Ligand binder design. Structure first.
Ligand SMILES: Nc1ccn([C@@H]2O[C@H](COP(=O)(O)OP(=O)(O)OP(=O)(O)O)[C@@H](O)[C@H]2O)c(=O)n1
Ligand SMILES: Nc1ccn([C@@H]2O[C@H](COP(=O)(O)OP(=O)(O)OP(=O)(O)O)[C@@H](O)[C@H]2O)c(=O)n1
Ligand SMILES: [Mg+2]
Ligand SMILES: [Mg+2]
Lengths: 221, 222
């Protein structure tokens, strides 16, 4: 079985809409509901735990809450929100951590991440070739190097894990700042396997990204 | 003089339109015309050299040829196209190499690149922190490491250079694979300075990208 943990507790500062980003609409439906729909449509998710902004917990339990759909208060940062949500994950052998902000993630991608876990990988992350050339820079913006593009991946969510591995990794988390779950698992020396991602699993962060997402939804309508 | 070189001689295989990408329309206008419009709006570009597929050289001179724009036949790959365009740049102080596919590149971004060159940087590239976490992977796609995202930039165009530095680099360029001009200059350890890019300067590559570009254009047109 697979449980999805959905961090949806951020304030959406960069989205500029005056409300937490999970509750901004896309085609008239909140981003959170899009993310939940993708998870349910994949057919491979047995349980969902959603971390929401703390003040909205009670209202969220009423709107989004249900038997296989558990609301928890989120934390100060994404790492804390995921840690809190893991307390409610239950006994599923696999955990997928999926940003509510990646609202148009295709159910296909979710299914592929679970399939790779079931195959035997302990940690599975979707990734794509970076669209732009990546350069390493120093603190003043001077280029230090241009890593080989073929060996880089821009990663997305859901990031999938054997549950025991993810719990171990989060039990070692310190201070936060990290918003990539795989990084915590890498610190245990657990192998992390990249699988093909999907350009539609982009993270909605700014008003431009929402314009883009509206365009995608309208084009696939 | 600041000269922009625009390689536009590619076939656009990944756009899957069956015709060269720079001539595919966006909002009723070829990507190339959008890119030229941005360069002109910046008010910092003196002239432009455009490399186009040899077949379309004559037509292109009629459509895009101008008092400030010269059309030349491009090459089999981007590197050759840039080299051929450099032949026609004249006595430039600065050369900016700009991908026509980044059709919605803001003029302020173009001006930032030129401004930094005038400050005395030999090589200047626009960039932003990557929107996604970047991982290094081995041949099987297993993670080798996660570089500090804050120390990475996803770079864009125009890439700006002191003309002599770029010309010396292009003299020893290898044909094929090389589509980041700064990388060529980096081979010698020439310093390259990042200036702020802009999410609008995305490279139109796929059918999806073009759908997105149409939507951006519509959004900003009131
Ligand atoms: N304290 C937090 C911060 C973030 N998130 C979640 O982590 C995902 C990725 O975060 P991000 O895209 O940064 O969203 P926000 O933090 O809401 O946006 P911003 O950083 O612009 O304020 C989002 O689904 C967000 O709701 C969370 O659950 N708890
Ligand atoms: N032989 C070539 C190949 C590419 N370019 C130019 O370089 C820019 C970036 O290249 P890319 O986005 O890869 O465009 P294409 O090569 O046309 O697309 P594809 O690789 O999908 O065929 C484009 O403006 C393109 O016209 C060029 O001048 N000469
Ligand atoms: Mg955030
Ligand atoms: Mg190409």
């Amino acid at each position: 079985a697979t449980v999805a943990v959905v961090p949806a507790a951020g304030s959406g500062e960069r989205l500029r809409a005056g409300r937490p980003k999970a509750f901004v609409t896309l085609g008239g439906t909140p981003l959170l509901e899009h993310a939940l729909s993708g998870l349910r449509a994949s057919g491979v998710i047995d349980r969902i735990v959603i971390a929401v902004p703390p003040a909205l917990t009670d209202e969220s339990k009423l709107v989004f809450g249900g038997e296989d759909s558990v609301i928890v208060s989120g934390g100060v940062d994404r790492t804390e929100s995921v840690a809190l949500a893991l307390e409610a994950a239950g006994d599923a052998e696999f955990v997928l951590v999926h940003d509510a902000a990646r609202a148009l993630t295709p159910p296909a991608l979710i299914a592929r991440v679970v399939a790779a876990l079931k195959e035997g990988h302990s940690a599975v992350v979707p990734g794509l070739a970076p669209a732009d050339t990546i350069k390493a820079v120093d603190a003043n913006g001077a280029v230090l190097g241009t890593p080989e593009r073929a060996g880089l991946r821009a990663v997305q969510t859901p990031q999938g894990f054997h549950a025991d591995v993810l719990r171990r990794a989060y039990a070692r988390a310190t201070a936060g700042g990290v918003t990539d779950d795989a990084s915590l698992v890498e610190q245990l020396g657990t192998p992390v396997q990249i699988v093909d991602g999907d350009p539609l699993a982009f993270k909605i962060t700014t008003p431009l990204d929402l314009v883009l997402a509206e365009a995608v939804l309208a084009h696939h309508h």
